[PDB]
Amino acid sequence: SFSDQNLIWIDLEMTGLDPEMHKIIEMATIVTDSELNILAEGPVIAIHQPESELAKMDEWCTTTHTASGLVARVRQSQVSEEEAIDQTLAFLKQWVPEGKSPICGNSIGQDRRFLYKHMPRLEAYFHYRYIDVSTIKELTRRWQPEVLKEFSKTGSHLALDDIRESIAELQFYRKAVFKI
Ligand code: NA
Numbered sequence: 533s534f535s536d537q538n539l540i541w542i543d544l545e546m547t548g549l550d551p552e553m554h555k556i557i558e559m560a561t562i563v564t565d566s567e568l569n570i571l572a573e574g575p576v577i578a579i580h581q582p583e584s585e586l587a588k589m590d591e592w593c594t595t596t597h598t599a600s601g602l603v604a605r606v607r608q609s610q611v612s613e614e615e616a617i618d619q620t621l622a623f624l625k626q627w628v629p630e631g632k633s634p635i636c637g638n639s640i641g642q643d644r645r646f647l648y649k650h651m652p653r654l655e656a657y658f659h660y661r662y663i664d665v666s667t668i669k670e671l672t673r674r675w676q677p678e679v680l681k682e683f684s685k686t687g688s689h690l691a692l693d694d695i696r697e698s699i700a701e702l703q704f705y706r707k708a709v710f711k712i
Contacts (some may be wrong), residue, residue, distance in 0.1 A: 533566070533571055533629070534626065534627055534628070534629070535565065535566075535628070536628070536629050536632040537544050537565065537566040537632075537665065538563050538564065538565055538566065538571065538627055538628040538632075538633060539563065539564045539565070539566065539568075539628075539633050539634070539636045540561060540563060540627075540628055540633040540634075540635065540636060540657070541561060541563070541564065541637055541657060541695045541698060541699060542559070542560070542561045542562075542634040542635060542636070542637055542640070542643060542647075542689040542695065543558050543559075543560055543637055543638075543643065543694050543695040543698070544556050544558065544559050544643045544646055544647075544691060545558035545559075545597065545604045545648060545689055545691050546593075547581065547585055547586060547588050547593060548588060548589060548590060548593055549642070549647045550568070550699070551646045551648070551649040551650065552557045552649065553588065554585075554588060554646075555579075555585045555619060555650065556579055556605075556613060556616075556623065556646055556651070557578065557579055557581055557586075557597065557602060557651055558576075558578050558605075558606075558690075558691045559576075559577050559578065559579065559616055559620065559691060560573075560574065560575070560576045560577070560600055560691035560692035560695055561573075561574030561575070561623065561624065562574060562692070562695050562696065562699065563624070563627040563628060564636075564699060568699060568702060568703050568706070570625075570696075570699065571627060571677075572627055573624040573625075574620055574624065575616070575619040575620055575623055575691065576691065577609075577611055577616045577619060577620070577642045577712070578602060578605035578606050578608075578609045578611070579606065579609060579611055579612065579613055579616050580606060580607075580609040580610060580611060580612060581606055583595065585620060586603065586606065586607075596689050596702075599689055600688060600689055602689070602690070613650055613651060614615065616651075617651050617653050617654045620654060621653070621654060621657065624657060629638065630656075630657055631656075631659055632633070632659055633658055633659055634658065634659050634660075634661040634662055634663045635647075635658045635659075635661075635662055635663070636662075636663040636665075636698070637663075637664070637695060637698050638664070638665050638666045638669075638694075638698045638701070639666045640662055640663070640664050641662060641664065644658075656687040665698050665701050665702045665705070666667070668677060668702070668705045668709065669701070669705075671709075672705065672708075672709050675709075676707055676709070679708050679709060683700075683701060683704045683708075685697045685701065702708065
């Protein structure tokens with residue numbers, strides 16, 4: 533089912549909002565076809581970081597990532613950023629050719645910033661364009677906001693679950709605000 537029309541969905545969790553200061557602590561990927569059918573889920577990787585990097589986390593980050601179990605998984609992880617890139621590339625090469633899929637997700641520009649800084653070999657696998665589901669969310673909020681009361685998110689900040697929610701959100705928009 534390898535195809536240059538398939539879409540690569542990705543979500544990261546980080547120790548904060550600033551790529552120059554903060555680090556990636558979780559990554560997950562999903563491949564859909566162009567019709568958003570989920571074809572395969574990629575590696576779900578808690579990336580090891582030392583305490584000094586975890587100690588940069590603000591209260592939101594600390595409470596969120598501790599309560600989810602991610603911090604414990606990060607502390608126990610034996611997978612570095614480079615190994616996480618290798619695993620993720622080995623998965624993606626089976627489903628989508630290099631340079632063809634936009635990066636897909638919610639406010640995915642932020643994730644791409646962290647990929648540019650910390651995982652440029654993975655960033656380079658994506659086409660330069662972005663499929664940002666939150667673009668459609670924002671346009672819907674302004675053009676017909678009552679549509680948004682028909683869809684809800686759990687928002688657990690477990691990377692695979694959140695990217696599954698991104699795909700479900702776009703699936704909802706296709707029926708609710710698109711006519712194609
Ligand atoms: Na995200």
